[PDB]
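Researcher: Re-running this chain for the archive, since the previous output was lost when a drive failed. Same request as before.
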Amino acid sequence: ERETKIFEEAFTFSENGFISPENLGCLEAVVSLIKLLKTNEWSTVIDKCIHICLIKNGMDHMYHSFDVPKCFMGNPITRDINWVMFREFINSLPGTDIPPWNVMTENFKKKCIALINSKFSEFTKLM
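Model: Regenerated structure tokens:
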């Protein structure tokens, strides 16, 4: 209860709340982004914590119905990952300042941007 209330107010990313369809849309890309790259310790901590939070609020089925959204594919069957738009999503992610999730959120964002470099706002209003 205590640490989940802290983590829900740490990943609000919107105005309505942690249960709104816009926040559930923007968490989907992060959970999808995680499952989609190299298994990091910070990435799997963020994944398990979002999973615990969606179990608590009664949205576990909506967690297990996650995939990449339609605003990151080029074709439905041809699984293509629009990395430039995804980098714009991660770069425009309003990560909060409250400890201890600000440091972890910032390091998560840095290693995701760094790993997509090593391979080579409007988003939440859309989804």
